[PDB]
Coordinates of C-alpha atoms and ligand atoms in Angstrom, one line a residue:
Chain A
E1 CA 76.7 116.6 126.3
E2 CA 74.3 115.0 123.9
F3 CA 71.5 112.5 124.5
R4 CA 71.6 108.8 123.6
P5 CA 68.7 106.4 124.3
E6 CA 71.3 104.0 125.8
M7 CA 71.3 106.2 128.9
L8 CA 68.0 104.7 130.0
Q9 CA 68.7 101.1 129.2
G10 CA 68.3 99.2 132.4
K11 CA 67.3 102.2 134.5
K12 CA 64.7 101.9 137.2
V13 CA 62.0 104.5 136.5
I14 CA 58.7 105.4 138.3
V15 CA 56.0 107.4 136.3
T16 CA 52.9 108.8 138.0
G17 CA 49.8 109.8 136.1
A18 CA 50.9 107.1 133.5
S19 CA 47.3 106.1 132.7
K20 CA 47.1 108.6 129.8
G21 CA 48.4 111.9 128.3
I22 CA 52.0 112.8 128.7
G23 CA 52.5 110.1 131.4
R24 CA 51.5 107.2 129.1
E25 CA 53.7 108.6 126.4
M26 CA 56.7 108.7 128.7
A27 CA 56.0 105.1 129.7
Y28 CA 56.2 104.1 126.0
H29 CA 59.4 105.9 125.4
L30 CA 61.1 104.6 128.5
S31 CA 59.9 101.1 127.4
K32 CA 61.5 101.5 123.9
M33 CA 64.7 102.4 125.6
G34 CA 64.8 99.2 127.6
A35 CA 64.1 100.7 131.0
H36 CA 62.5 99.1 134.1
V37 CA 59.2 100.9 134.8
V38 CA 56.6 101.0 137.5
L39 CA 53.4 103.0 136.7
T40 CA 50.6 104.5 138.8
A41 CA 47.3 106.2 138.5
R42 CA 43.7 105.7 139.7
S43 CA 42.3 103.2 137.2
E44 CA 43.7 99.7 137.3
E45 CA 42.1 98.9 133.9
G46 CA 43.9 101.8 132.2
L47 CA 47.3 100.9 133.8
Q48 CA 47.0 97.3 132.6
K49 CA 46.7 98.4 129.0
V50 CA 49.8 100.6 129.1
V51 CA 51.8 98.0 131.0
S52 CA 51.0 95.5 128.4
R53 CA 52.0 97.9 125.6
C54 CA 55.3 98.6 127.5
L55 CA 56.6 95.0 127.4
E56 CA 55.3 94.9 123.8
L57 CA 57.6 97.9 123.2
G58 CA 60.7 96.5 124.8
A59 CA 60.4 97.4 128.4
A60 CA 63.1 95.6 130.4
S61 CA 60.3 95.3 133.0
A62 CA 56.8 96.8 133.6
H63 CA 54.5 96.9 136.6
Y64 CA 51.6 99.0 138.0
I65 CA 50.2 100.0 141.3
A66 CA 46.7 101.8 141.2
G67 CA 45.8 104.4 143.7
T68 CA 44.8 108.0 144.5
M69 CA 47.5 110.6 145.2
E70 CA 45.0 112.3 147.5
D71 CA 46.1 109.8 150.1
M72 CA 49.5 110.7 151.4
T73 CA 50.1 107.3 153.0
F74 CA 49.5 105.6 149.6
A75 CA 51.8 108.1 147.9
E76 CA 54.5 107.3 150.4
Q77 CA 54.0 103.5 150.3
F78 CA 53.8 103.5 146.5
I79 CA 57.4 104.7 146.3
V80 CA 58.8 102.0 148.6
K81 CA 56.8 99.2 146.9
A82 CA 58.0 100.4 143.5
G83 CA 61.5 100.5 144.9
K84 CA 61.2 96.9 146.0
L85 CA 59.8 95.6 142.8
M86 CA 62.7 97.0 140.8
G87 CA 65.3 96.8 143.6
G88 CA 66.1 100.5 143.5
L89 CA 65.3 103.7 141.7
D90 CA 67.2 105.8 139.1
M91 CA 64.5 108.2 138.0
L92 CA 61.3 109.5 139.5
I93 CA 58.8 111.3 137.2
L94 CA 56.2 113.2 139.1
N95 CA 53.5 113.9 136.5
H96 CA 50.0 113.4 138.0
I97 CA 47.6 116.2 138.9
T98 CA 44.0 116.4 140.1
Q99 CA 41.0 117.0 137.8
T100 CA 41.1 120.7 136.9
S101 CA 38.5 122.7 135.0
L102 CA 38.9 126.3 133.6
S103 CA 36.7 128.9 135.4
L104 CA 37.0 132.3 137.0
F105 CA 37.7 131.7 140.6
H106 CA 34.7 132.2 142.9
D107 CA 34.9 130.2 146.1
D108 CA 35.2 126.5 146.7
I109 CA 38.1 126.4 149.1
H110 CA 37.8 122.6 149.4
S111 CA 38.8 122.5 145.8
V112 CA 41.9 124.6 146.3
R113 CA 43.0 122.4 149.1
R114 CA 42.5 119.2 147.1
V115 CA 44.6 120.8 144.3
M116 CA 47.4 121.8 146.7
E117 CA 47.2 118.3 148.2
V118 CA 47.5 116.3 145.0
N119 CA 49.4 118.7 142.8
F120 CA 51.9 119.8 145.4
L121 CA 51.9 117.9 148.7
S122 CA 51.9 114.4 147.2
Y123 CA 55.0 115.5 145.2
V124 CA 57.0 116.5 148.3
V125 CA 55.9 113.2 150.0
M126 CA 57.0 111.0 147.1
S127 CA 60.2 112.9 146.5
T128 CA 61.0 112.6 150.2
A129 CA 60.4 108.9 150.3
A130 CA 62.3 108.3 147.1
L131 CA 65.4 110.3 148.0
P132 CA 67.2 107.6 149.9
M133 CA 67.3 105.2 146.9
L134 CA 68.0 108.1 144.5
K135 CA 71.0 109.0 146.5
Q136 CA 72.3 105.5 146.1
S137 CA 72.1 105.6 142.3
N138 CA 72.8 109.3 142.0
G139 CA 69.4 109.4 140.3
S140 CA 67.1 112.2 139.1
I141 CA 63.6 113.6 139.7
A142 CA 61.6 115.2 136.9
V143 CA 58.9 117.6 138.1
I144 CA 56.2 118.3 135.5
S145 CA 54.9 121.8 135.5
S146 CA 53.7 124.2 132.9
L147 CA 53.8 127.8 131.7
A148 CA 51.2 128.4 134.3
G149 CA 53.9 127.6 136.9
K150 CA 56.1 130.4 135.5
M151 CA 53.4 132.9 134.5
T152 CA 49.8 133.8 135.1
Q153 CA 46.8 133.4 132.9
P154 CA 43.1 133.6 134.0
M155 CA 40.8 130.8 135.0
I156 CA 43.4 128.4 136.6
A157 CA 44.3 130.1 139.9
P158 CA 44.4 126.9 142.0
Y159 CA 46.3 124.9 139.4
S160 CA 48.6 127.8 138.9
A161 CA 49.2 128.2 142.6
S162 CA 50.2 124.5 142.9
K163 CA 52.7 124.7 140.0
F164 CA 54.3 127.9 141.3
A165 CA 54.6 126.1 144.7
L166 CA 56.4 123.3 142.9
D167 CA 59.0 125.7 141.5
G168 CA 59.5 127.3 144.9
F169 CA 60.0 124.0 146.8
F170 CA 62.0 122.0 144.3
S171 CA 64.2 124.8 143.3
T172 CA 65.2 125.1 146.9
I173 CA 65.8 121.4 147.2
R174 CA 67.9 121.4 144.0
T175 CA 70.3 124.0 145.4
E176 CA 70.3 122.2 148.8
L177 CA 71.3 118.9 147.3
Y178 CA 74.0 120.7 145.3
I179 CA 75.2 122.7 148.2
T180 CA 75.6 119.6 150.3
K181 CA 77.2 117.8 147.4
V182 CA 74.6 115.1 146.9
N183 CA 74.5 114.0 143.3
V184 CA 70.8 113.9 142.7
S185 CA 69.4 116.2 140.0
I186 CA 66.0 118.0 139.9
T187 CA 64.6 118.9 136.5
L188 CA 61.5 121.2 136.4
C189 CA 59.7 120.7 133.1
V190 CA 57.9 123.8 131.9
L191 CA 55.3 122.6 129.3
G192 CA 53.2 124.7 127.0
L193 CA 49.8 123.4 125.6
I194 CA 50.0 119.7 124.8
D195 CA 47.4 117.9 122.6
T196 CA 46.3 115.4 125.3
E197 CA 42.5 114.7 125.0
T198 CA 42.1 116.0 128.5
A199 CA 43.7 119.4 127.7
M200 CA 41.8 119.9 124.4
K201 CA 38.5 119.0 126.0
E202 CA 39.2 121.5 128.9
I203 CA 40.1 124.6 126.8
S204 CA 37.3 124.0 124.2
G205 CA 35.4 127.2 123.7
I206 CA 37.9 129.1 125.8
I207 CA 41.4 128.9 124.5
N208 CA 42.6 129.3 120.9
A209 CA 46.3 128.4 121.1
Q210 CA 47.9 125.7 119.0
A211 CA 49.0 122.5 120.9
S212 CA 52.2 120.6 120.6
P213 CA 52.5 116.8 120.0
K214 CA 52.4 114.8 123.2
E215 CA 54.8 112.2 122.0
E216 CA 57.7 114.7 121.3
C217 CA 56.9 116.4 124.7
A218 CA 57.3 113.1 126.5
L219 CA 60.7 112.6 124.7
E220 CA 62.1 116.0 125.6
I221 CA 61.2 115.4 129.3
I222 CA 63.1 112.1 129.3
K223 CA 66.1 113.8 127.5
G224 CA 66.4 116.8 129.7
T225 CA 66.1 114.7 132.9
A226 CA 68.6 112.1 131.7
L227 CA 70.9 115.0 130.9
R228 CA 70.4 116.3 134.4
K229 CA 69.2 119.8 133.2
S230 CA 67.7 122.1 135.8
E231 CA 64.8 123.2 133.6
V232 CA 63.3 122.0 130.4
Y233 CA 60.9 124.2 128.3
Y234 CA 58.7 122.7 125.7
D235 CA 56.2 124.9 123.8
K236 CA 55.5 125.8 120.2
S237 CA 57.0 129.2 120.5
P238 CA 60.8 129.5 120.6
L239 CA 60.4 132.7 122.6
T240 CA 58.9 130.9 125.6
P241 CA 62.2 129.7 127.1
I242 CA 63.8 133.1 126.7
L243 CA 60.8 135.1 128.0
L244 CA 60.1 132.8 131.0
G245 CA 63.7 131.8 131.8
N246 CA 64.1 134.7 134.3
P247 CA 67.9 135.5 134.1
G248 CA 67.4 138.1 136.8
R249 CA 66.4 135.4 139.2
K250 CA 69.5 133.3 138.4
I251 CA 71.7 136.3 139.2
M252 CA 70.0 137.0 142.5
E253 CA 70.2 133.3 143.6
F254 CA 73.9 133.1 142.8
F255 CA 74.7 136.2 145.0
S256 CA 72.3 135.2 147.7
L257 CA 74.4 132.1 148.7
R258 CA 77.3 134.4 149.6
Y259 CA 75.4 135.5 152.7
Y260 CA 75.1 132.0 154.1
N261 CA 77.4 130.6 156.8
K262 CA 79.1 127.9 154.7
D263 CA 79.3 125.7 157.8
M264 CA 75.5 125.2 157.7
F265 CA 76.0 122.8 154.8
Chain B
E1 CA 50.0 160.0 141.3
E2 CA 51.6 160.6 144.7
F3 CA 50.6 159.4 148.2
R4 CA 48.9 161.5 150.8
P5 CA 48.1 160.1 154.3
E6 CA 44.6 161.5 153.8
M7 CA 44.0 158.6 151.5
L8 CA 43.5 156.3 154.5
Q9 CA 41.6 158.8 156.7
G10 CA 38.4 157.0 157.6
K11 CA 39.3 153.9 155.6
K12 CA 38.2 150.5 157.1
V13 CA 41.3 148.3 157.4
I14 CA 42.0 144.7 158.5
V15 CA 45.6 143.7 159.4
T16 CA 46.6 140.1 160.2
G17 CA 49.7 139.2 162.1
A18 CA 49.3 142.5 163.9
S19 CA 50.6 141.6 167.4
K20 CA 54.2 142.3 166.3
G21 CA 56.7 142.8 163.6
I22 CA 55.7 144.6 160.4
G23 CA 52.1 144.0 161.1
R24 CA 52.2 146.0 164.3
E25 CA 54.1 148.8 162.6
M26 CA 51.4 148.9 159.9
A27 CA 48.7 149.2 162.6
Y28 CA 50.5 152.2 164.0
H29 CA 50.8 153.8 160.6
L30 CA 47.1 153.3 159.6
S31 CA 46.2 154.7 163.0
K32 CA 48.3 157.9 162.7
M33 CA 46.5 158.4 159.4
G34 CA 43.1 158.2 161.1
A35 CA 41.9 154.8 159.8
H36 CA 39.4 152.4 161.2
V37 CA 41.3 149.2 162.1
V38 CA 40.6 145.7 163.3
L39 CA 43.6 143.5 164.1
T40 CA 44.2 139.8 164.5
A41 CA 46.8 137.3 165.8
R42 CA 47.0 134.5 168.3
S43 CA 48.3 136.5 171.3
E44 CA 45.3 138.2 172.9
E45 CA 47.6 139.9 175.4
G46 CA 49.8 141.1 172.5
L47 CA 46.9 142.5 170.5
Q48 CA 45.6 144.4 173.5
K49 CA 48.9 146.4 173.8
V50 CA 48.8 147.4 170.1
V51 CA 45.1 148.3 169.9
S52 CA 45.6 150.6 172.9
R53 CA 48.6 152.2 171.2
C54 CA 46.5 152.7 168.1
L55 CA 43.8 154.7 169.9
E56 CA 46.5 156.9 171.4
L57 CA 48.0 157.3 168.0
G58 CA 44.7 158.6 166.6
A59 CA 42.8 155.7 165.1
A60 CA 39.2 156.3 164.1
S61 CA 38.5 153.1 165.9
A62 CA 40.4 149.9 166.8
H63 CA 39.5 146.3 167.7
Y64 CA 41.2 142.9 167.9
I65 CA 40.1 139.3 167.6
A66 CA 42.6 136.7 168.8
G67 CA 42.7 133.4 167.0
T68 CA 44.8 130.9 164.9
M69 CA 44.8 131.1 161.2
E70 CA 45.3 127.3 161.1
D71 CA 41.5 127.3 161.5
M72 CA 39.9 128.0 158.2
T73 CA 36.5 128.7 159.9
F74 CA 38.0 131.1 162.3
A75 CA 39.7 132.7 159.3
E76 CA 36.5 133.2 157.2
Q77 CA 34.5 134.3 160.3
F78 CA 37.1 136.7 161.4
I79 CA 36.6 138.6 158.2
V80 CA 32.8 138.6 158.5
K81 CA 32.9 139.9 162.2
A82 CA 35.5 142.6 161.4
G83 CA 33.4 143.7 158.5
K84 CA 30.3 144.0 160.7
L85 CA 32.3 145.9 163.3
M86 CA 33.5 148.6 160.9
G87 CA 30.4 148.5 158.7
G88 CA 32.4 147.6 155.6
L89 CA 36.0 147.0 154.4
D90 CA 38.3 149.2 152.3
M91 CA 41.7 147.4 152.6
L92 CA 42.7 143.8 153.6
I93 CA 46.3 143.3 154.6
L94 CA 47.2 139.6 154.7
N95 CA 50.5 139.5 156.7
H96 CA 50.4 136.5 159.1
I97 CA 52.8 133.5 158.8
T98 CA 53.2 130.2 160.7
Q99 CA 56.5 129.6 162.5
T100 CA 59.5 128.3 160.5
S101 CA 63.2 128.1 161.2
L102 CA 66.0 127.9 158.8
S103 CA 67.0 124.3 158.1
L104 CA 67.9 122.0 155.2
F105 CA 64.7 120.2 154.3
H106 CA 64.4 116.5 155.3
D107 CA 60.9 114.9 155.8
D108 CA 58.8 117.2 157.9
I109 CA 55.6 116.6 155.9
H110 CA 53.2 117.8 158.6
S111 CA 55.1 121.1 158.8
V112 CA 54.8 121.5 155.0
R113 CA 51.1 121.0 155.2
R114 CA 50.8 123.4 158.1
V115 CA 52.8 126.0 156.3
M116 CA 50.7 125.8 153.1
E117 CA 47.6 125.9 155.3
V118 CA 48.5 129.0 157.2
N119 CA 50.8 130.8 154.7
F120 CA 48.6 130.2 151.7
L121 CA 45.1 128.6 152.2
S122 CA 44.0 130.9 155.0
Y123 CA 44.9 133.8 152.6
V124 CA 42.6 132.6 149.8
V125 CA 39.9 131.9 152.4
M126 CA 40.1 135.4 153.8
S127 CA 40.3 137.1 150.4
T128 CA 37.3 135.1 149.2
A129 CA 35.3 136.0 152.3
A130 CA 36.3 139.7 152.0
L131 CA 35.9 140.2 148.3
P132 CA 32.1 141.0 148.4
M133 CA 32.7 144.0 150.8
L134 CA 35.8 145.1 148.8
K135 CA 33.7 145.1 145.6
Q136 CA 31.3 147.6 147.2
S137 CA 34.0 150.1 148.1
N138 CA 36.4 149.2 145.3
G139 CA 38.9 148.2 147.9
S140 CA 42.3 146.7 147.9
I141 CA 44.2 143.7 149.1
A142 CA 47.8 143.6 150.2
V143 CA 49.4 140.2 150.3
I144 CA 52.8 140.2 152.1
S145 CA 55.5 138.1 150.4
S146 CA 59.3 138.1 150.3
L147 CA 62.2 137.8 148.0
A148 CA 61.8 134.0 148.7
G149 CA 58.5 134.3 146.8
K150 CA 60.3 135.4 143.6
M151 CA 63.6 133.6 143.9
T152 CA 65.1 130.6 145.7
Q153 CA 67.5 130.3 148.7
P154 CA 68.4 127.3 150.8
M155 CA 66.9 126.3 154.1
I156 CA 63.3 127.6 153.6
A157 CA 61.7 125.3 151.0
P158 CA 58.3 125.1 152.8
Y159 CA 58.1 128.9 153.3
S160 CA 59.3 129.6 149.8
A161 CA 56.7 127.2 148.3
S162 CA 53.9 129.0 150.1
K163 CA 55.1 132.4 149.0
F164 CA 55.4 131.2 145.3
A165 CA 51.9 129.8 145.6
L166 CA 50.6 133.2 146.7
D167 CA 52.1 134.9 143.6
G168 CA 50.5 132.3 141.3
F169 CA 47.1 132.4 143.0
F170 CA 46.8 136.2 143.5
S171 CA 48.3 137.3 140.2
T172 CA 45.6 135.2 138.6
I173 CA 42.9 136.7 140.8
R174 CA 44.3 140.2 140.0
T175 CA 44.0 139.7 136.3
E176 CA 40.6 138.1 136.6
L177 CA 39.3 141.1 138.6
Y178 CA 40.7 143.3 135.8
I179 CA 39.2 141.6 132.8
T180 CA 35.7 141.3 134.4
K181 CA 35.9 145.1 135.1
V182 CA 35.8 144.7 138.9
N183 CA 37.7 147.6 140.6
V184 CA 39.5 145.8 143.4
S185 CA 43.2 146.0 143.4
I186 CA 45.8 143.3 144.5
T187 CA 49.2 144.4 145.7
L188 CA 51.9 141.7 146.2
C189 CA 54.6 143.1 148.5
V190 CA 58.0 141.6 148.0
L191 CA 60.1 142.2 151.1
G192 CA 63.8 141.8 151.6
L193 CA 65.3 141.1 155.1
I194 CA 63.4 143.2 157.6
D195 CA 64.6 144.3 161.0
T196 CA 62.1 142.4 163.1
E197 CA 63.0 140.4 166.2
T198 CA 61.7 137.2 164.7
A199 CA 63.7 137.6 161.5
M200 CA 66.9 138.7 163.2
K201 CA 66.6 135.8 165.7
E202 CA 65.9 133.2 163.1
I203 CA 68.8 134.0 160.8
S204 CA 71.4 134.3 163.7
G205 CA 74.5 132.4 162.9
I206 CA 73.0 131.2 159.6
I207 CA 72.6 134.2 157.4
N208 CA 74.7 137.4 157.7
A209 CA 73.1 140.2 155.8
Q210 CA 71.9 143.8 156.4
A211 CA 68.2 144.3 157.3
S212 CA 65.9 147.2 156.5
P213 CA 63.9 149.2 159.2
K214 CA 60.5 147.6 160.0
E215 CA 58.8 151.0 160.3
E216 CA 59.7 152.3 156.8
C217 CA 58.8 148.9 155.4
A218 CA 55.2 149.1 156.8
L219 CA 54.8 152.6 155.4
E220 CA 55.8 151.5 151.9
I221 CA 53.3 148.6 152.0
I222 CA 50.5 151.0 152.9
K223 CA 51.5 153.6 150.3
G224 CA 51.8 151.0 147.6
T225 CA 48.5 149.4 148.4
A226 CA 46.8 152.8 148.7
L227 CA 48.2 153.6 145.2
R228 CA 46.9 150.3 143.9
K229 CA 50.3 149.2 142.6
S230 CA 50.4 145.6 141.4
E231 CA 53.7 145.0 143.1
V232 CA 55.8 146.6 145.8
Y233 CA 59.5 145.8 146.3
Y234 CA 61.2 146.9 149.5
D235 CA 64.8 145.9 150.0
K236 CA 68.3 147.4 150.6
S237 CA 69.4 147.2 147.0
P238 CA 67.9 149.3 144.2
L239 CA 68.8 146.5 141.9
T240 CA 66.4 144.0 143.5
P241 CA 63.2 145.3 141.9
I242 CA 64.9 145.2 138.5
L243 CA 66.4 141.8 138.9
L244 CA 63.2 140.2 140.2
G245 CA 60.7 142.2 138.2
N246 CA 60.6 139.5 135.5
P247 CA 59.7 141.7 132.4
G248 CA 59.7 138.6 130.2
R249 CA 56.8 137.2 132.2
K250 CA 54.8 140.4 131.9
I251 CA 55.3 140.2 128.1
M252 CA 54.1 136.5 128.0
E253 CA 51.0 137.3 130.1
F254 CA 50.0 140.1 127.8
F255 CA 50.3 137.9 124.7
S256 CA 48.6 134.9 126.2
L257 CA 45.4 136.8 126.9
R258 CA 44.9 137.1 123.2
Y259 CA 44.0 133.4 122.9
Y260 CA 41.1 133.6 125.4
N261 CA 37.4 133.9 124.3
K262 CA 36.5 137.3 125.7
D263 CA 32.9 136.2 126.2
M264 CA 34.0 134.1 129.1
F265 CA 35.0 137.2 131.1
Ligands
NDP1 N1 48.2 118.7 128.4 C1 48.6 120.0 128.5 O1 48.2 120.8 127.7 C2 49.6 120.3 129.5 C3 49.9 119.4 130.5 N2 50.8 119.8 131.5 C4 51.2 118.9 132.7 O2 51.4 117.6 132.2 C5 51.2 116.7 133.3 C6 50.2 115.6 132.8 O3 49.2 116.4 132.0 P1 48.2 115.7 131.0 O4 48.8 114.6 130.2 O5 47.6 116.7 130.1 O6 47.1 115.2 132.0 P2 46.1 113.9 132.1 O7 44.8 114.4 132.8 O8 45.8 113.4 130.7 O9 46.8 112.9 133.0 C7 46.7 112.9 134.4 C8 47.3 111.7 135.0 O10 47.1 111.7 136.5 C9 46.3 110.6 136.9 N3 45.4 111.1 138.0 C10 44.4 111.9 137.9 N4 43.9 112.3 139.1 C11 44.6 111.6 140.1 C12 44.6 111.4 141.5 N5 43.7 112.0 142.4 N6 45.5 110.5 142.1 C13 46.4 109.9 141.4 N7 46.5 110.0 140.0 C14 45.6 110.8 139.4 C15 45.6 110.1 135.6 O11 45.2 108.8 135.7 P3 43.8 108.5 136.4 O12 42.8 109.6 136.1 O13 43.3 107.1 135.8 O14 44.1 108.4 137.9 C16 46.5 110.4 134.5 O15 47.2 109.2 134.0 C17 50.7 117.5 134.6 O16 51.7 117.6 135.7 C18 50.2 118.8 133.9 O17 50.0 119.9 134.8 C19 51.4 121.1 131.4 C20 51.1 122.0 130.4 C21 50.1 121.6 129.4
NDP2 N1 61.2 140.1 158.8 C1 61.7 139.7 157.6 O1 62.9 139.6 157.4 C2 60.7 139.5 156.6 C3 59.3 139.4 156.7 N2 58.4 139.1 155.6 C4 57.0 139.0 155.7 O2 56.4 139.7 156.8 C5 55.2 139.0 157.3 C6 55.3 139.0 158.8 O3 56.5 139.8 159.2 P1 57.5 139.4 160.4 O4 57.6 140.6 161.4 O5 58.8 139.0 159.9 O6 56.8 138.2 161.2 P2 56.5 137.9 162.7 O7 56.8 136.4 163.0 O8 57.3 138.8 163.6 O9 55.0 138.2 162.9 C7 54.1 137.2 162.5 C8 52.6 137.5 162.8 O10 51.9 136.4 162.5 C9 51.1 135.9 163.6 N3 51.0 134.5 163.7 C10 52.0 133.5 164.0 N4 51.5 132.3 164.0 C11 50.2 132.4 163.6 C12 49.1 131.5 163.4 N5 49.2 130.1 163.6 N6 47.8 132.0 163.1 C13 47.6 133.3 162.9 N7 48.6 134.2 163.1 C14 49.9 133.8 163.4 C15 51.8 136.5 164.8 O11 50.9 136.6 165.9 P3 50.9 135.4 167.0 O12 52.4 134.8 167.2 O13 50.4 136.0 168.4 O14 49.9 134.4 166.5 C16 52.3 137.9 164.4 O15 51.4 138.9 164.8 C17 55.1 137.6 156.6 O16 53.9 137.6 155.8 C18 56.5 137.5 156.0 O17 56.6 136.5 155.0 C19 59.0 139.0 154.4 C20 60.4 139.1 154.2 C21 61.2 139.3 155.3
OCT3 C1 64.0 134.2 155.1 C2 64.8 135.4 155.7 C3 66.2 135.5 155.1 C4 66.3 136.2 153.7 C5 67.9 136.2 153.3 C6 68.2 137.3 152.3 C7 69.5 137.2 151.6 C8 69.7 138.3 150.6
OCT4 C1 46.0 125.7 130.4 C2 47.2 126.4 129.9 C3 46.9 127.1 128.6 C4 48.1 127.9 128.0 C5 47.7 128.9 126.9 C6 48.7 130.0 126.6 C7 49.5 129.8 125.3 C8 50.8 130.5 125.3

């Protein structure tokens, strides 16, 4: 199976955190492929610029709904509104996160909660609300994560906890959908350092690593999700996918199912 | 180095989720070794029975403070009170969990939030509140997890997400303590199916597998934490630790540290 930009022509796609960074780049790529898109983020001014650029790029349709993912009711209602605007949904791309800064963890529990709320909870809420429509189109969900969701590095404990949580939850959902024969795919995207101005600003004077181009990253996420792959790794080093792939875990998961009462699903 | 019960003689230890299961068995073990102990759980009546048995068993002292870990203030204050009571803290064992039954996930968002609150948030709250005392005695922290915190299995998405989150948060904390030269150890205990009433009852008719004895499990957790091991695996199969150990991750974490500005530590 090889990718062809035709696979997204006419598709109905939602993209969160599309105001800038990887999100904005995915909007552009989806637009050049003739897809229908609905974007979201906090700033209405920023969303308007990208939506304009989207039609200008060939988007079969482009719209935006500004709001904060800290509000679960908004996250939930966002999905249904987007669904109505496009008359369905083929692909959901959960990409947004809350403002994170690098620092050794001290206290600030309220910060950890906000991180788990926006980075994790809003994702389960949106995926839950979008599943009905996704089941109708045998759609897909792309969950944006990072190396920090597969490994540990200092100064990002909260962020790291939220990304690990995403793997735990959605990997379970993926196998439940598959075990109950529902044709909806879940692609976890493991991203290394990307040259977004947010990232660069944040690791300045702290991290030395080389960053990858945000445009190609955006493309690989689209490709892997359209190809219904379980996981997509994108990092400068070709060793990252092999060192973080965890083949031992795959073996354990396969054999674990043999203990379940097959009548439960 | 090898373990010797004398390593806990006189040690000041906190154990959550101590009214039953593995937590109760840990209380009995710490007691026989002559440790000071303060237990917690929701059942006041239940805690009473165990603290009494602890004194009989030979505890240097034993107290209990009933409460719900769904309350972040009760969680942080439980640690301060317990600390005052023993005059310090040597070991913190985070073992409590909110209720969860096996079931294919659907849309129980309030449950998910509750699970992350109890299973994860309260844990960071307590570890934060306890760290100052642990720093004075170069103490340890044991965070109880399960196979579901290293791998994925159907019907426990919420639980699994909270356990993955613990790995991400605490492995970061562990490495941060280490690079700043603070001598406090963090032991993640990965448990297979344990022979507790709650477990056996919850998997009935759903999962058919062999469980390990709760008493030996408790003893291994204590020995591992006492020896300051980073991780402890306790399961039927001797292959489990190897398959879930993720050596690739350990390699990636080692190499990534090289890109950090050591002045920040
Ligand atoms: N850049 C990198 O190096 C790496 C990035 N990633 C992953 O990429 C994804 C995007 O990263 P990146 O492009 O760098 O991030 P950005 O900060 O550039 O983008 C974040 C997006 O989320 C939106 N947003 C921020 N706060 C909230 C909120 N409370 N509610 C709703 N929306 C919000 C932003 O719009 P607005 O602020 O206007 O709301 C923005 O469009 C994430 O899931 C991230 O963890 C992974 C590895 C590396
Ligand atoms: N048994 C097994 O197969 C396995 C167990 N484990 C791990 O072991 C630990 C507990 O072991 P297990 O014996 O199975 O669990 P149990 O359900 O038997 O014990 C749970 C403990 O948590 C307490 N608890 C329950 N609800 C709350 C709450 N809202 N606030 C504070 N405390 C609460 C209980 O006290 P009370 O009800 O009075 O509040 C009890 O003392 C967990 O951390 C778990 O993930 C891991 C893998 C397998
Ligand atoms: C969550 C308790 C069940 C774990 C099942 C283990 C199958 C090897
Ligand atoms: C915030 C994530 C930084 C990743 C740096 C590690 C490079 C392999």
